[PDB]
Amino acid sequence: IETVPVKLKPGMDGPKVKQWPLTEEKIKALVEICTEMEKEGKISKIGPENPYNTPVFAIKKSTKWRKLVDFRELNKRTQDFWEVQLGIPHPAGLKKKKSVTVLDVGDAYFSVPLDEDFRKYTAFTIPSINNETPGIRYQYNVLPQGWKGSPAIFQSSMTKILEPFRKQNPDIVIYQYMDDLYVGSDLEIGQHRTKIEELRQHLLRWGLTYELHPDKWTVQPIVLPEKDSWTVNDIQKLVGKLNWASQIYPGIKVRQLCKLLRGTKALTEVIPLTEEAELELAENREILKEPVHGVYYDPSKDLIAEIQKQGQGQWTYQIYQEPFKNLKTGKYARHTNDVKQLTEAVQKITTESIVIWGKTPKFKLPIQKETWETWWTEYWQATWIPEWEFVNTPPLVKLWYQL
Amino acid sequence: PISPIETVPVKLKPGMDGPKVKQWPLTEEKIKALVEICTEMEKEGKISKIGPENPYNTPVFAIKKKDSTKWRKLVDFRELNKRTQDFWEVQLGIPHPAGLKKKKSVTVLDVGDAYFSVPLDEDFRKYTAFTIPSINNETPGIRYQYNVLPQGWKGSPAIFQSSMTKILEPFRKQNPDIVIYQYMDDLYVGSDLEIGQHRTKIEELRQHLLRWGLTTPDKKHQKEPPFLWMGYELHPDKWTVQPIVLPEKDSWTVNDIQKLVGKLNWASQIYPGIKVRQLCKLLRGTKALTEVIPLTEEAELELAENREILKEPVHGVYYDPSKDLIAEIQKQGQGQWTYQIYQEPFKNLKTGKYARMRGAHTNDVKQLTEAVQKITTESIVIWGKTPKFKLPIQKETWETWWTEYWQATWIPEWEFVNTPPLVKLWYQLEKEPIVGAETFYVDGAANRETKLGKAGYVTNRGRQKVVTLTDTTNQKTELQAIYLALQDSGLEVNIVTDSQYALGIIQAQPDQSESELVNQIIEQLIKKEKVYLAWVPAHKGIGGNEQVDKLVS
Ligand SMILES: Cc1cc(C#N)cc(C(=O)c2c(C(C)C)c(=O)[nH]c(=O)n2Cc2cc(N)nc(F)c2)c1
Numbered sequence: 042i043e044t045v046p047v048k049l050k051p052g053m054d055g056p057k058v059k060q061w062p063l064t065e066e067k068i069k070a071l072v073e074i075c076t077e078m079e080k081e082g083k084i085s086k087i088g089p090e091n092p093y094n095t096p097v098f099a100i101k102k103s104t105k106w107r108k109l110v111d112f113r114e115l116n117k118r119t120q121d122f123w124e125v126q127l128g129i130p131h132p133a134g135l136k137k138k139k140s141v142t143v144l145d146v147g148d149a150y151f152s153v154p155l156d157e158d159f160r161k162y163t164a165f166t167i168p169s170i171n172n173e174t175p176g177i178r179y180q181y182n183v184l185p186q187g188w189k190g191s192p193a194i195f196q197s198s199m200t201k202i203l204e205p206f207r208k209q210n211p212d213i214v215i216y217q218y219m220d221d222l223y224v225g226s227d228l229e230i231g232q233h234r235t236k237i238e239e240l241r242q243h244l245l246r247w248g249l250t251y252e253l254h255p256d257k258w259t260v261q262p263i264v265l266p267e268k269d270s271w272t273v274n275d276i277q278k279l280v281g282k283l284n285w286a287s288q289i290y291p292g293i294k295v296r297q298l299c300k301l302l303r304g305t306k307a308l309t310e311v312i313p314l315t316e317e318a319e320l321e322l323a324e325n326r327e328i329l330k331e332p333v334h335g336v337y338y339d340p341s342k343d344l345i346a347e348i349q350k351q352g353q354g355q356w357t358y359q360i361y362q363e364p365f366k367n368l369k370t371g372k373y374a375r376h377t378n379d380v381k382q383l384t385e386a387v388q389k390i391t392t393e394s395i396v397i398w399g400k401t402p403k404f405k406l407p408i409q410k411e412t413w414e415t416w417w418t419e420y421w422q423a424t425w426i427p428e429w430e431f432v433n434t435p436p437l438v439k440l441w442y443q444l
Numbered sequence: 445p446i447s448p449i450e451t452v453p454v455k456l457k458p459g460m461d462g463p464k465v466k467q468w469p470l471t472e473e474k475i476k477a478l479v480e481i482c483t484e485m486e487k488e489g490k491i492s493k494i495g496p497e498n499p500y501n502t503p504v505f506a507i508k509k510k511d512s513t514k515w516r517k518l519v520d521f522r523e524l525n526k527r528t529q530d531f532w533e534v535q536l537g538i539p540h541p542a543g544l545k546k547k548k549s550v551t552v553l554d555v556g557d558a559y560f561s562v563p564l565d566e567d568f569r570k571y572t573a574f575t576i577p578s579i580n581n582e583t584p585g586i587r588y589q590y591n592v593l594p595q596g597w598k599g600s601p602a603i604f605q606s607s608m609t610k611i612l613e614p615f616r617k618q619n620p621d622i623v624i625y626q627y628m629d630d631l632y633v634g635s636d637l638e639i640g641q642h643r644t645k646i647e648e649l650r651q652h653l654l655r656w657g658l659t660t661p662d663k664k665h666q667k668e669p670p671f672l673w674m675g676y677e678l679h680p681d682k683w684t685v686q687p688i689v690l691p692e693k694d695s696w697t698v699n700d701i702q703k704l705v706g707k708l709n710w711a712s713q714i715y716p717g718i719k720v721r722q723l724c725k726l727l728r729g730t731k732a733l734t735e736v737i738p739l740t741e742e743a744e745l746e747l748a749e750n751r752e753i754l755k756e757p758v759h760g761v762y763y764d765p766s767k768d769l770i771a772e773i774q775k776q777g778q779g780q781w782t783y784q785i786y787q788e789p790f791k792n793l794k795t796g797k798y799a800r801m802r803g804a805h806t807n808d809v810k811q812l813t814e815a816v817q818k819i820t821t822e823s824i825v826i827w828g829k830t831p832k833f834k835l836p837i838q839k840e841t842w843e844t845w846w847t848e849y850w851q852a853t854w855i856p857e858w859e860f861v862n863t864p865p866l867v868k869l870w871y872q873l874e875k876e877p878i879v880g881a882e883t884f885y886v887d888g889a890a891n892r893e894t895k896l897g898k899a900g901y902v903t904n905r906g907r908q909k910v911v912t913l914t915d916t917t918n919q920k921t922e923l924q925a926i927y928l929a930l931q932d933s934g935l936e937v938n939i940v941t942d943s944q945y946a947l948g949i950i951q952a953q954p955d956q957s958e959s960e961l962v963n964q965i966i967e968q969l970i971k972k973e974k975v976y977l978a979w980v981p982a983h984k985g986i987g988g989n990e991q992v993d994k995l996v997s
């Protein structure tokens with residue numbers, strides 16, 4: 042097959058990211074896997090004249106170790122190729138479907154040759170314990186999993202594979218993102234699962250051996266309590282929370298309510314609700330129930346996700362592009378392992394973003410950098426990796442998105 | 445010899461051409477020394493003489509070897525190196541003795557003339573051209589180019605290492621039972637064969653190496669145990685750091701104290717309990733290395749305690765892959781933590797130290813957690829797995845912290861061990877307002893140009909008060925106003941602030957701070973029976989917030 046010429050974005054050089062230390066069991070699983078891939082010609086050992094590197098990890102799906110390459114830098118540095126030059130259009134109808142199934146089709150890439158001149162940029166290293174030896178160095182000979190270039194290049198072949206099935210089912214939406222296919226229909230869950238089975242058979246002829254419910258997706262509205270008697274402290278928390286909301290939702294009003302907070306009162310004192318405060322309150326509940334008037338997705342802009350730890354295995358999140366301009370808010374709940382729970386929430390929030398916008402967010406994670414770096418791999422199950430940074434949650438924000 | 449191994453293809457940086465620097469004219473004795481050196485290298489094939497067209501050039505020099513009458517050829521590859529491609533890193537991390545398995549028998553081999561025993565990419569040799577100038581530079585010089593890896597060229601260490609690795613590979617496949625560590629131009633080789641069948645396997649290895657152009661010391665010339673390697677002393681069943689001598693001096697300079705701290709830091713790998721806080725404190729400030737620093741009393745106490753620890757020699761043991769690793773941590777005092785890692789109590793594989801602060805304000809629970817994370821990482825590096833921890837903190841204390849703190853946090857399998865001082869939380873804030881506890885509405889404000897400040901409070905019992913602060917930031921006054929309310933209130937108090945800043949700091953339950961204020965607030969929060977902290981939006985006309993906002997201005 043004829044390779045597609047690939048080019049880095051102008052000026053900038055390839056990835057030079059350091060390999061993270063790996064446990065012995067993961068190093069062994071990677072050696073096994075790469076020894077096998079090498080025999081099959083998918084990768085080749087390289088010399089020191091290749092200065093690039095990207096990190097690799099082992100994840101365990103199933104009781105089978107799998108290789109995960111962290112192509113975040115390469116993807117960032119080749120962004121002209123997979124986004125503007127080629128690039129898969131994202132369907133707005135996908136998020137509308139009653140059911141969306143995610144199928145892994147990463148195996149497909151291993152049969153397409155990679156541009157000879159681009160191969161050096163896919164260099165990665167298997168480390169050794171206590172630096173007994175130099176790492177084992179490899180680069181790719183075929184479209185690698187995890188590179189955003191791979192689906193971009195395999196795009197026109199995927200279209201042929203899917204054409205009979207699309208023609209036969211015009212009301213099914215199929216979208217490719219990185220290594221996965223997203224398949225949405227409005228069918229009853231039995232006919233839906235049957236169609237996925239059929240799709241698998243189509244894929245199976247070309248060497249490609251869970252269910253979302255986007256309808257069930259709705260805002261996690263900032264909730265104002267319904268209370269029996271209100272204390273000064275309670276009214277204060279209310280104003281605080283509505284004060285925050287008014288940064289986001291037009292039409293939020295606070296006047297009638299904090300009229301109640303007059304003079305210097307003991308925090309536990311009971312204060313009766315004004316006919317007006319109660320209307321204002323209710324009128325605010327109306328507004329919080331709905332989407333944010335004035336906020337729209339700008340496809341030229343990165344997505345950001347903030348996560349808050351709420352205790353009792355509950356986590357709240359917001360997605361926006363400019364701060365406080367929420368495109369979406371939600372929650373994930375239910376381990377007494379914080380890192381494990383955070384990992385799950387990140388993957389779930391990422392998955393939603395792909396379906397909604399065909400883009401992955403950069404996460405602001407409420408956790409020590411080193412803690413996350415050591416541990417996230419133990420639980421990660423996806424075949425992509427979002428960008429993340431590490432942040433200390435403002436104690437206020439956590440409170441205002443409480444449930 | 446020059447290895448018959450295939451060459452590594454090498455190129456210059458994408459926009460660049462090879463060097464073309466001008467040979468300085470040299471004295472006659474230097475010209476003579478170079479001719480003699482180059483002729484001998486030419487005979488072994490290390491270099492080949494050339495004439496133009498080759499346009500490239502790198503300057504050569506000759507230096508007199510020590511007091512001796514031997515000459516050495518120095519090549520200044522500064523330019524060629526700027527113009528040479530980047531290579532992947534040679535070897536990122538060096539072996540730690542604590543991570544070695546025990547070996548019945550071991551041999552140390554160093555490759556002779558390592559670089560000169562490995563061939564240079566044929567296409568690249570021309571860029572290494574240099575010129576021995578003629579006497580006073582009158583006639584055309586004698587021009588050579590390298591056929592082997594030049595000393596001081598950018599690519600040599602990486603290409604050598606990869607050549608040794610390609611060469612060693614076949615011997616590794618056929619000999620899994622045998623260990624070979626590569627470090628620079630050394631090999632360290634070990635088995636659990638008795639001396640006989642080992643000396644024999646070594647010879648196979650030397651011979652394999654010779655087939656490939658690499659010469660090594662014979663039995664007679666191989667170093668003997670113990671090995672002094674990289675600051676360490678390696679023996680058949682223990683290791684330690686090389687002997688450490690702490691100088692006695694009447695007066696210490698900046699440079700003496702830096703060197704002392706370096707030695708102590710090196711010693712802390714295996715000597716438990718070394719401390720350097722009070723010695724590093726001295727290093728604070730701006731001074732010349734020559735300047736004498738009077739030892740504070742605490743520094744002097746610390747040097748003595750260190751002195752006693754070093755008095756008797758200590759050693760570590762090697763790693764047994766079939767046993768778990770246990771890690772123990774102890775609080776040593778003000779921000780200082782020490783740890784030991786053993787598999788059999790209490791024969792340490794190694795020890796270590798942790799001090800770093802993470803911010804201006806922390807508590808002991810956070811710090812302990814950071815030390816656990818740091819030890820976990822080092823343990824994965826050295827042994828390829830995480831240790832089981834024994835921590836001086838009650839399970840209940842840790843779970844009370846984990847549940848209520850806003851950051852995700854987590855430590856692997858651990859157990860409590862009663863080794864005081866134990867780590868605890870020294871106060872907890874109320875989760876609800878306190879009935880019958882006076883409510884203080886506090887505020888602070890500073891004028892941006894003046895730096896004048898007013899901190900105050902109004903209470904629901906009609907108390908009021910404001911003090912004036914000089915040269916204070918708008919956020920220092922917010923802390924003052926809270927301190928003020930703490931020191932005028934009862935054992936139970938509700939405090940209402942509009943400072944997210946102040947709230948953030950207090951809500952994290954600090955037990956130590958770089959701030960005097962925060963440290964005074966803390967000693968107050970400990971005294972109390974109950975404290976509840978609420979936050980309100982500033983300037984919304986809320987409650988008593990307006991009243992105290994008005995008094996400060
Ligand atoms: C990094 C380095 C550097 C140098 C050097 N120079 C020597 C060694 C070793 O010998 C060594 C090795 C080698 C094979 C990597 C090992 O696997 N395990 C081990 O315990 N040792 C120490 C030792 C063992 C022994 N029986 N007698 C001694 F005296 C020392 C290691």
Ligand SMILES: [Cl-]
Pocket residue numbers: 252253254255257
């Ligand atoms: Cl769902």
